[PDB]
Structure 1
Amino acid sequence: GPVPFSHCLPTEKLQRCEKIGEGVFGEVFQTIADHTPVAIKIIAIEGPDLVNGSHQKTFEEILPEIIISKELSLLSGEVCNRTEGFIGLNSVHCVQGSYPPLLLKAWDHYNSTKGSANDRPDFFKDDQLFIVLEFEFGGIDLEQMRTKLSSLATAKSILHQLTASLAVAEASLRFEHRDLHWGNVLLKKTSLKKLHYTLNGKSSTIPSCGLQVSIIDYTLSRLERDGIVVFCDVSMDEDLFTGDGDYQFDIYRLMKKENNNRWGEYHPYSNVLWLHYLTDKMLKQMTFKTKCNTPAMKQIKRKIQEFHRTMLNFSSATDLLCQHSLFK
C-alpha cells in the first residue's frame, strides 16, 4: 500500500530540498542524502482535481514511465547491451498525503526567483496519491548550457554519447525516446577521459570532453520485452501535433508521418529524427566559448555539418553509430 512522504523524504532530506524544475506533469526537486545529490520527480495521480490545467494520470497511465525508467537505468549493469547514458533510477514509491509544507517552501522560493507556470500544490487532501521517482542527479540541461560549452568538439562528444545510448537501447529494448528535446539532455562534469558502451556484445569508447550525457524524461517513450509493448498512445492527442516556432514541433508531426499514427509499432527512425533536431540545435542555437579557428577544429565543424545533411538517410541510431563517418 502507499507510504507517507516521510518515507521518501525523512526530515533532513526534506529540509534540503530545492526546486529545480517543473512541467504540467508536476514538480522536480533536488536534495542530498549520504553526501550525494539526487533528483525527485513528484507526480499527482488518481484524483479528480485539475493540476496545472490538466487531468491527473491514473496509475495505468503513469506505469509506462515507471517501467521505462527502470529498464533504461538497468542498462548500466548489463553485458551485451550496456550504457550509462540514461539517468539512474534509485527508487519509486506511491505516496499518500497532502503536500509537505517544506516542499511548498521550496516551491515558493522558485516562484519568487524564477517564476512558475504551475499551480501552488497546496490544495491536495490527506488521501491524495502521488508517484515519487528518485533519480541520480544528472546535471544541467543542454538548453540551459546554450552559452556554456567550450567548443564544437564538445558538441561532437555529446552527439556521439546520445547516438550510442539510443543505439544500445534500440538493440536491447526496441526503444524510442519520442520527446528528446534539448531540455531532456543533461550534462555533468566527469573526470573520465573516455566513456564506455557495449552494443550487441561489441565494446567501444567515446572521448568525453569532460562531460557525461544523461537522457531523461520517458513520458512519451516506447519499448518492448518479449513482444509486450509499453508506450504512450498519443494517436488521439491534437495539441501535440500543432506546435510551431521550433523544429521540435515538426518532429512530432514527422514521427506521426513515419508511423502512420500507430504508436505501438517500432519505428527507430524517430530516434534519428530527434538526433537530427539535436544536431540542428548544436549548429544553429548553441554558441561556444571558443569558435573553430584551428585546422583540426575546422574539420570537426565540417563533419558535424556533414552529419546534419546526411543523417536523415539512416534508419536508426544503431545504423548511425555503426555506419556514419562522424563516428569513425
Structure 2
Amino acid sequence: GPVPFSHCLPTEKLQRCEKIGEGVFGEVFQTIADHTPVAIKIIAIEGPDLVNGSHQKTFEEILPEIIISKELSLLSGEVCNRTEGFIGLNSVHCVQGSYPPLLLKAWDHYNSTKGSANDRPDFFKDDQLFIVLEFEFGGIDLEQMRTKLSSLATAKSILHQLTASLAVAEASLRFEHRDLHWGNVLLKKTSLKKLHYTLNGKSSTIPSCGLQVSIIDYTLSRLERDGIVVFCDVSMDEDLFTGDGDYQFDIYRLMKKENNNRWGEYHPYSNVLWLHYLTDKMLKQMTFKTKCNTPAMKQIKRKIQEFHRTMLNFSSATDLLCQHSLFK
C-alpha cells in the first residue's frame, strides 16, 4: 500500500530540500541523505484537481516513466549493453498526504528568487496520492551551462557521451528519448579521464574532459522488452507539434513526419534528430569561456560543423556512433 511522505522523506532529508526544477507534471527537489545529494521528482496522481493547469495522471499513465527510468538506470550494471549516461534511479514510492509544509517552504524560496509558473502545491488533501521518484544527482543541465563550458572539445565529449548512451539504449531496449532538449542533458565534474560503455559486447572509452553526461526525463520516451512496447501515445495531441521560436519545436513535427504519427513503432531516427538539435545548440545558442583560437581546436570545430552537416543522413545513434568520422 501507499506510505506517508515521512517514509521517503524523514525530517532531516525533508529539512534539507531545495527546489531545483518544475514542470506541469509537478515538482523536482534536491536534498542530502547519507552525505549524498539526490533529486526528488514528485507527481500528484489520481486526483480530480487541475495541477499547474492540467489533469493529474492516473497510476497507469505514470508507469511508463517508472519502467523506462528503471530500465535505463539498470544499463549501468549490464554487460553487452552498458552505459552510465542515463540517470540512476534510487527508488520509487507511492505516497499519501497533503504536501509537507517544509516542501512548501522550499517551493516559496524558489518562487521568490527565481519565480515559478506552477500553482503553490498547498491545496492537496490528506488522501492525495503522489509518485516520488528519487534519482542520482546528475549536476546542472545544458541550458543553464550555455556560458559555463570551457572549450568546444568539451562539446565533443558531450555529443560522444550522448550518442554512445542512446546507441547502447537502441541496442538494448529499442529506445527513443523523444524529448531530449538541452534541459534534459545534465553535467557533472568527474575525476575519470576515460568513460566506459559496451555496445553489443564491444567495449570502448570516451575522453570526459572531466564531465559526466546524464540524460534525464523519460516522459515522452519509448522502448520494448520481448515485444512489450512502453511509450507515450501523443497521436491525439495538438500543442506539442504547434510550438515554435526554437529548433526544438520542429523536432516534434519532424518525429511525427518520420513515424507517421504511429508512436508505438521504433523510429531510432528520432534520436538522430535530437542529437542534431543538440549539435545545433552547441554551434549557435551555446557560447564558451575559451573560443577556438589554436590549430588542433579548430580541427575539432570543423569535425562538429561536419557532424551538424552530415549526421541527419544517419538512421540511428547506433549508425552515428559506429560509422561517423567524428568518433573515429
TM bucket, shorter chain = over 0.9
Secondary structure of 1:255's match? helix
Q: Distance in 1 between matches of 2:57 and 2:237?
A: 15
Cα deviations across residues 141-172 of structure 1 (Å, max 9, x unaligned)?
A: 00000000001000000000000000000000
Residues 233-252 of structure 1, C-alpha deviation per residue, up to 9 Å, x if partnerless?
00001100000100000000
> Shift of the alpha carbon at 1:208?
0.1
1:289-321 C-alpha deviation (Å, 9 max, x unpaired): 111111100100000000000000000000000
User: What is the CA deviation profile of residues 97-125 of structure 1, one whole-angstrom value per residue up to 9, with x for unaligned ones?
Assistant: 00000000000010110000000000000
1:41-79 CA-to-partner distances (Å, cap 9, x unmatched) read 000000000000000000110000000000000000000
Task: State the alpha-carbon separation in 1 of the partners of residues 123 and 293 from structure 2.
Answer: 56
CA shift for structure 1 position 206: 0.1
**Cα RMSD after superposing both structures:** 0.3
Structure 2 Cα separation of the partners of residues 295 and 325 of structure 1? 19
Paired residue secondary structure (1:263): coil
1:254 shift after superposition: 0.1
Cα distance in 2 for partners of 1:218, 1:175 equals 10
- Render the CA deviation track for 1:231-286: whole Å, top value 9, x for unaligned: 00000011000001000000000000000000000000000000000000000011
> How many Å separate the matches in 1 of 2:171 and 2:158?
20
State the SS of the aligned residue for 2:244. coil
> Where does 1:42-121 land on structure 2 (aligned, <5 Å)?
42-121=42-121
Residue 184 of structure 1: how far off its partner (Å):
0.2
CA distance in 1, matches of 2:5, 2:150: 41
TM-score calculated relative to the size of structure 1 = 1.00
Distance in 2 between residues matched to 1:82 and 1:102, nearest whole Å: 38
Tell me the CA shift for residue 38 of structure 1: 0.2
Residue of structure 2 equivalent to 1:172: 172
| Separation in 2, partners of 1:21, 1:180 | 16
1:139 corresponds to: 139
- SS class of match (1:211): coil
SS at match of 1:79: coil
Across the two proteins, how many residue pairs are aligned to each other? Answer: 328
Q: Deviations over 1:201-237 (max 9, x none)?
A: 0000000001000000000000000000000000001
| Residue aligned with 1:287, SS | coil
TM-score, normalised by the number of residues in structure 2: 1.00
Q: Give the % identical residues.
A: 100
Partner SS for 2:248? helix
